[PDB]
């Protein structure tokens, strides 16, 4: 049935972004993805019980709409939801969130003599990504300046990279990182492989759509322009995000045949049948490939990762090693990349920042668990020893705590 809960939609000049329908309580029939209502927690099927603290039981459809459209400011709704996931992310939605309050406090920190970077970090790294979008809209509405552009001018160094990354939606951030990894002579293959190998179907579908809107070209077309050989074939196949979905039935016969084919195409023979590896590892569901990799050990003297190191080299080897890691244990995969970015001289800040930003609301808690288990000390500890200043503090907030 759903308990009466309060959602707070920020003032939006383009509309709150949800459809009111009814016949008695009016219900929400559809929600614009990424719109103001979507970010505040309004979901499909919500029955509207109060609009800005007035009970609308028995009101007409026009009256509920007119009450919603009246103030032209924020929209506080009391909704009854069909009782319905970011449960392992470090950054949670801030309770008692007020975008206007945060926007004004952020502008105060920007206008503070010398720029109050501390307050900017304390706010933005302790709000969810959707809450940051609400702040950005309220900021522009009161300053007539875009928040990202204002923060670009106020901040610098690695802290600027972090803050600007947090302000983008997940699909916008991934799309811009992909573009940055391909733009310019050559390519950051490691950045391209990390994103393409680790993102799921749903994520890649939104990345492809957002990439096309941001840059007016297909992501697949830019991957082709900047890659070649079997590496291109693998990246193009993964980037389509059309992997088979996790099924209810375990296909034990296919698991065995897939494991034989991987062996026959690689260790068993001289050379490698690279397209056979690509077909199996990009088309089968992740739970399927997990069991394929264990069954593969029944035929091969080396496991899947070791077989890759012996068969292929270069970018293709890197891509296969990253992909198999993501299929086997993705939190452990990111934990190892985090360790690699800090273990030696200096810091691979680009990698550290991108992981802390993109995984903060996905599986950072599992990343921290795999990290502490494998390396003995916390991810928090390594960030402290490798980074300094407000830049360090923002990364520590994205981490979420010690251990």
């Amino acid at each position: 049935m759903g308990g009466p809960r309060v959602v707070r939609i920020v003032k939006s000049e383009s509309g709150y972004g949800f459809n009111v329908r009814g016949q008695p309580l009016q219900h929400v029939s559809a929600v614009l993805p990424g719109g103001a209502a979507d970010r505040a927690g309004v979901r499909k099927g919500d029955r509207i019980l109060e609009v800005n603290h007035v009970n609308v039981e028995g009101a007409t459809h026009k009256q509920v709409v007119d009450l919603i459209r009246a103030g032209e400011k924020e929209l506080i709704l009391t909704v009854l939801s069909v009782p319905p996931g970011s449960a392992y992310g470090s950054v949670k939605a801030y309770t008692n969130f007020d975008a206007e309050r945060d926007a004004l406090n952020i502008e105060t920190a920007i206008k503070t003599k010398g720029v109050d970077e501390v307050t900017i970090v304390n706010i933005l790294t302790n709000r969810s990504n959707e809450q940051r979008q609400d702040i950005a809209f309220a900021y522009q509405r009161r300053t007539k300046k875009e928040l990202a552009s204002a923060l670009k001018s106020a901040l610098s160094g690695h802290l600027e990279t972090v803050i600007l990354g947090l302000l983008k939606t997940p699909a916008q951030y991934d799309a811009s990182e992909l573009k940055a990894s391909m733009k310019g002579l050559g390519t950051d293959e490691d950045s391209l492989i990390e994103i393409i190998c680790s993102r799921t179907n749903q994520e890649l579908q939104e990345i492809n759509r957002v990439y096309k809107e941001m840059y007016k070209t297909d992501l697949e077309k830019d991957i082709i322009s900047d890659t070649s050989g079997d590496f291109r074939k693998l990246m193009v196949a993964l980037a389509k995000g059309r992997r088979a979905e996790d099924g209810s039935v375990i296909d034990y016969e296919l698991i065995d045949q897939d494991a034989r084919d991987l062996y026959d195409a690689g260790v068993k023979r001289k050379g490698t049948d690279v397209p056979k590896w690509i077909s199996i590892m990009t088309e089968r569901s992740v739970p399927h490939l997990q069991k394929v990799f264990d069954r593969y050990k029944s035929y091969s003297p080396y496991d899947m990762l070791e077989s890759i190191r012996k068969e292929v080299k270069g970018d293709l080897e890197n891509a296969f090693l990253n992909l198999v890691q993501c299929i086997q244990n993705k939190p452990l995969y990111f934990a190892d990349r985090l360790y690699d970015s800090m273990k030696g001289k200096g810091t691979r800040d680009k990698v550290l920042i991108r992981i802390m930003v993109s995984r903060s609301e996905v599986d950072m808690l599992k990343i921290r668990s795999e990290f502490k288990r494998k390396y003995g000390k916390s991810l928090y500890y390594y960030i402290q020893q490798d980074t300094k200043g407000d830049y360090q503090k923002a990364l520590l907030y994205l981490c979420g705590g010690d251990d």
Binding site: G15, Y16, G17, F18, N19, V20, R21, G22, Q23, S29, H61, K62, V65, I68, R69
Partner: peptide
């Protein structure tokens, strides 16, 4: 059924 976007 009446509907409208807001």
């Amino acid at each position: 059924p009446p509907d409208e976007w807001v």
